[PDB]
XYZ file of N, CA and C in Angstrom:
339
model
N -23.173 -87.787 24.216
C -23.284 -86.889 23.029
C -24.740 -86.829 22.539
N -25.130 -88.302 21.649
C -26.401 -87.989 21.122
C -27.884 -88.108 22.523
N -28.832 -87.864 22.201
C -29.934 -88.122 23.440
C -29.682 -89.370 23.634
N -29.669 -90.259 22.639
C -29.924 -91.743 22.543
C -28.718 -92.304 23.845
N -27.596 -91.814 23.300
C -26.520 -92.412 24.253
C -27.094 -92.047 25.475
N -27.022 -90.611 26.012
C -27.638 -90.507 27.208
C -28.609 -91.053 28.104
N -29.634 -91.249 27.063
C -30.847 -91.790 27.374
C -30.290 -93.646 28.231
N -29.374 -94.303 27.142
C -28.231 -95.077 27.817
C -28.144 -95.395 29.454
N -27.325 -93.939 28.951
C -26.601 -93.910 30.331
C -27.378 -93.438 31.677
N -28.157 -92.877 31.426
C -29.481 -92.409 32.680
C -29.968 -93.838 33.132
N -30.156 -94.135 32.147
C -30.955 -95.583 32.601
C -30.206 -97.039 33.410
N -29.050 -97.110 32.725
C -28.049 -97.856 32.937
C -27.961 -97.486 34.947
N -27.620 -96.075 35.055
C -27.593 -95.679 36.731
C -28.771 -95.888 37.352
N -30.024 -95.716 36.558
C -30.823 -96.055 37.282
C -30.952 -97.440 37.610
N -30.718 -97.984 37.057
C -30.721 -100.125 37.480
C -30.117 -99.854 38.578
N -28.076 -99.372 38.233
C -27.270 -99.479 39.401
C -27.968 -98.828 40.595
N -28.722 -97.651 40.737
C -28.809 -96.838 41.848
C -30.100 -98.205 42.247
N -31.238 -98.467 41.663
C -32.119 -99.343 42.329
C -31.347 -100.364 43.173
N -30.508 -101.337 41.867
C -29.993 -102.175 43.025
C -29.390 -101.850 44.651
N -28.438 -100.703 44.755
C -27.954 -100.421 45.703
C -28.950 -99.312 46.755
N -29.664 -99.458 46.178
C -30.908 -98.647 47.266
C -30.477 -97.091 47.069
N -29.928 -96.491 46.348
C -29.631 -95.215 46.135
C -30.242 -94.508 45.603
N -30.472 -93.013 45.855
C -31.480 -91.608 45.470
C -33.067 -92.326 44.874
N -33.222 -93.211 45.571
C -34.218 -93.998 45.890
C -35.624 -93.172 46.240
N -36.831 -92.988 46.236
C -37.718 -91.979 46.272
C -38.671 -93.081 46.594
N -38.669 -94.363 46.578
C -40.153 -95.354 47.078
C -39.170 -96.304 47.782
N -39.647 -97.139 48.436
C -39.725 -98.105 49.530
C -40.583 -98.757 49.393
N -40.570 -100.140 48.981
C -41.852 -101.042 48.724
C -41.386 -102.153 49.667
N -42.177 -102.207 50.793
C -42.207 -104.037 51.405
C -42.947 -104.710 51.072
N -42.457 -105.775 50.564
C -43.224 -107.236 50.147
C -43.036 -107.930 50.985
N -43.721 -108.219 52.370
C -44.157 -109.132 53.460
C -42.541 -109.071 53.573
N -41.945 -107.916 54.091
C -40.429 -107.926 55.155
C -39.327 -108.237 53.794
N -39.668 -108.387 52.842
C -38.751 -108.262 51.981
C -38.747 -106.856 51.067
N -37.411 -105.968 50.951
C -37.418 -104.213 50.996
C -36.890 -104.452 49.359
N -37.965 -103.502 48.956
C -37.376 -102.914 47.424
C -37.007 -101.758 47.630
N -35.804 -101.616 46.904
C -35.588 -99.819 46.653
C -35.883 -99.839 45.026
N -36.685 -98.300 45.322
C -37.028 -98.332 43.756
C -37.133 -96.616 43.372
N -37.772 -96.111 42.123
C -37.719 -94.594 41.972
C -38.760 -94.729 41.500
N -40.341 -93.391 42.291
C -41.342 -93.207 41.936
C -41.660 -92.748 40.204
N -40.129 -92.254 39.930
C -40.481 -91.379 38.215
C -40.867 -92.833 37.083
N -39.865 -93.634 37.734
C -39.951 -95.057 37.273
C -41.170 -95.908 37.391
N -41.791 -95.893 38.431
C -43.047 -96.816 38.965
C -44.028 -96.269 38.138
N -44.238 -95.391 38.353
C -45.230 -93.905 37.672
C -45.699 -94.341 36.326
N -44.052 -94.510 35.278
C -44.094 -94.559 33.975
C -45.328 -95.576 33.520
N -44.656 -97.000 34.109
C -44.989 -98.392 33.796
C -46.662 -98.538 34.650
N -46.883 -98.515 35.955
C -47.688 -98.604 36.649
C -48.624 -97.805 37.082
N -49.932 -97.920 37.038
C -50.903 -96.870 36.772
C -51.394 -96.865 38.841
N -51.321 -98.193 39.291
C -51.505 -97.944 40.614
C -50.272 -97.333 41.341
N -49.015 -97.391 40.510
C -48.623 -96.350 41.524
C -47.720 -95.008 41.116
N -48.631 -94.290 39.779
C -49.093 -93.247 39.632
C -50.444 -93.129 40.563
N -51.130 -93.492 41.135
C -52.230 -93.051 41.739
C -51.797 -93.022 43.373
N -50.956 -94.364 43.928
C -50.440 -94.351 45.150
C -49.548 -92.912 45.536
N -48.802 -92.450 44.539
C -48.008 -91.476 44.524
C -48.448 -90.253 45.552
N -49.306 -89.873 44.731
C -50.425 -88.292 45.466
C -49.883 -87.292 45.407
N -49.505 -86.689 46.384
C -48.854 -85.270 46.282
C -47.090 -85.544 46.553
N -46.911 -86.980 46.669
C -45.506 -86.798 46.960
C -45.267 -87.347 48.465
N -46.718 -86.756 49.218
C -46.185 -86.756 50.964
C -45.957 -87.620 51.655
N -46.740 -89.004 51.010
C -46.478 -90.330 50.985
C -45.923 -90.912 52.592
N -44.748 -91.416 52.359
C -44.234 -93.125 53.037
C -44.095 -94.429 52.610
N -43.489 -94.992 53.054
C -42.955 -96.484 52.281
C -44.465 -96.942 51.990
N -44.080 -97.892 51.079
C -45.469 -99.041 50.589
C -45.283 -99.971 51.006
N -45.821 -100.930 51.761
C -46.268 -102.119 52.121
C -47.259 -103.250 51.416
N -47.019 -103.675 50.237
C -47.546 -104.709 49.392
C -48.345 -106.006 50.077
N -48.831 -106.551 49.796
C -49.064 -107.863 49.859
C -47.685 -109.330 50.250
N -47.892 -109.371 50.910
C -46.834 -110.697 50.904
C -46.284 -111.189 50.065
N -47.805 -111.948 48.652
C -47.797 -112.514 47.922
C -47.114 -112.134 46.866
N -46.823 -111.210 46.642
C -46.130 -110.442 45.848
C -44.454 -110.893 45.460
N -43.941 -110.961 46.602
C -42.683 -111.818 46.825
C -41.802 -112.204 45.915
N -42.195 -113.054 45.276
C -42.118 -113.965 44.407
C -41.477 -113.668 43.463
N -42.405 -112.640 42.463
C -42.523 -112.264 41.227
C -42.147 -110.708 40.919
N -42.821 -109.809 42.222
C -42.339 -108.410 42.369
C -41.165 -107.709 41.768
N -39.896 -108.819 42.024
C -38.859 -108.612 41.261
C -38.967 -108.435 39.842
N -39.562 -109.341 39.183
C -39.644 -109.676 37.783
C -40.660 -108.346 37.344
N -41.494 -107.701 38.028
C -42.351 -106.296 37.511
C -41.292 -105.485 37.927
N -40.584 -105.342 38.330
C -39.697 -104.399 38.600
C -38.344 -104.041 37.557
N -38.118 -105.386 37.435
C -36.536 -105.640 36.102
C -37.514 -105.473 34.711
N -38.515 -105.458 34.432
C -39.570 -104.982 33.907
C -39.841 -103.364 33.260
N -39.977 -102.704 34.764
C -40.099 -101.441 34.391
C -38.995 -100.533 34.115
N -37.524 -101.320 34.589
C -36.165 -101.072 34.773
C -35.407 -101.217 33.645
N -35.854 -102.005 32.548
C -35.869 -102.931 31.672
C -35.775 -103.456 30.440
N -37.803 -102.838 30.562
C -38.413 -103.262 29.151
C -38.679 -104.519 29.246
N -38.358 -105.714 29.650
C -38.262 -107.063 29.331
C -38.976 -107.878 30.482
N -39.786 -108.598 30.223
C -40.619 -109.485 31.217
C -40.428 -110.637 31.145
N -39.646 -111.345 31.912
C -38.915 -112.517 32.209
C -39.856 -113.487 32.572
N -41.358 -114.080 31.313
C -42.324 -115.124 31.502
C -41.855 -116.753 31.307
N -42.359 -117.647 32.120
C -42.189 -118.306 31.850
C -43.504 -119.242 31.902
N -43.626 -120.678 31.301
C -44.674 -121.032 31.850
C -45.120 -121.321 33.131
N -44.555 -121.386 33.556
C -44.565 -121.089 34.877
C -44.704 -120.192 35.995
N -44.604 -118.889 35.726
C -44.924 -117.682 36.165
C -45.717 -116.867 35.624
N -46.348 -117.512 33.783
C -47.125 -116.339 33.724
C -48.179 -116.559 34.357
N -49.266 -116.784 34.880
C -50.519 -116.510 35.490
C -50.008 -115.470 36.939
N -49.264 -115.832 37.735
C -48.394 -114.999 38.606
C -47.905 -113.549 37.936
N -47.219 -113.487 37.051
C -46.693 -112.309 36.705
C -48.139 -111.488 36.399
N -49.112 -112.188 35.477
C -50.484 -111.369 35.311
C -50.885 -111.130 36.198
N -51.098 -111.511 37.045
C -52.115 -111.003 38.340
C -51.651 -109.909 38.733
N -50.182 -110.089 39.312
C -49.182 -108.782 39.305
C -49.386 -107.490 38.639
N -49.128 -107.871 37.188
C -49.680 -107.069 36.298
C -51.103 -106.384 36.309
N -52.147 -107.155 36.400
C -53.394 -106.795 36.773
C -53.552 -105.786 38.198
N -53.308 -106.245 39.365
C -53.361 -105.511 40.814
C -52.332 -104.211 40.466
N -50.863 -104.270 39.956
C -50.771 -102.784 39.556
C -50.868 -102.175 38.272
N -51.634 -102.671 38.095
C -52.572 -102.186 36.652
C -51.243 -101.593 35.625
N -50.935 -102.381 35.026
C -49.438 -102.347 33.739
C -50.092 -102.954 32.965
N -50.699 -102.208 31.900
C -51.351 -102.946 30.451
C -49.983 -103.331 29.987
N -48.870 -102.824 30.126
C -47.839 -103.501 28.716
C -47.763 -105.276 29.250
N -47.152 -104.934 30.705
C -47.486 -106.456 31.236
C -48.823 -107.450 30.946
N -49.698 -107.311 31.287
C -50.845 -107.641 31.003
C -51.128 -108.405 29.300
N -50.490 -107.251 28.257
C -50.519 -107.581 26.742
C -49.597 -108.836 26.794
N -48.297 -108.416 27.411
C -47.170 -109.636 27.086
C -47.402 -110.734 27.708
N -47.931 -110.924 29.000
C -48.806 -112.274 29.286
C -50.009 -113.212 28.713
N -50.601 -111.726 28.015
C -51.556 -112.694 27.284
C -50.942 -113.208 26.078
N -50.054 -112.915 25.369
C -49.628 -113.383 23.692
C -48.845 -114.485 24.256
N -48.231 -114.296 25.384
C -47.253 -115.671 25.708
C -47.906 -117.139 25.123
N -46.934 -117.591 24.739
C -47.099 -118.854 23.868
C -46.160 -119.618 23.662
């Protein structure tokens, strides 16, 4: 009914469709481990891949290995809203943050406390 609900429910499918690799538009490998994800999504949050994007004509992304780890956690992130720091992962999640250039990430790592 209202936008708000909708807004809801768009989002809500979009988690489900990521998890299950569905109407999926990026392909990210992290050293042989496969994300399905949606470029409208990456775009929003991530400024490197609004720039990786280009005209669209693209092909899967191939990350860093190192990425692994934490990749998930920028991802449930942009999926989200919520950045799952711990002491333990934030210097990891920043770097993350930093290489695909996500100031919101970046802010919420630094106030961590």
């Amino acid at each position: 009914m209202s936008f708000v609900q909708h807004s809801v429910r768009v989002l809500q499918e979009l988690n489900k469709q990521r998890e299950k690799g569905q109407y999926c538009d990026a392909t990210l490998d992290v050293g042989g481990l496969v994300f399905k994800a949606h470029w409208s999504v990456l775009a929003c949050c991530s400024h490197f891949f609004q720039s990786l994007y280009g005209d669209g004509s693209g092909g899967s992304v191939v990350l860093p290995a190192g990425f692994a780890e934490i990749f998930g956690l920028l991802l449930d992130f942009f999926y989200t809203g919520h950045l799952a720091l711990t002491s333990g992962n934030r210097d990891q999640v920043l770097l993350a943050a930093r290489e695909l250039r996500v100031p919101e990430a970046v802010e919420l790592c630094q106030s961590f406390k």
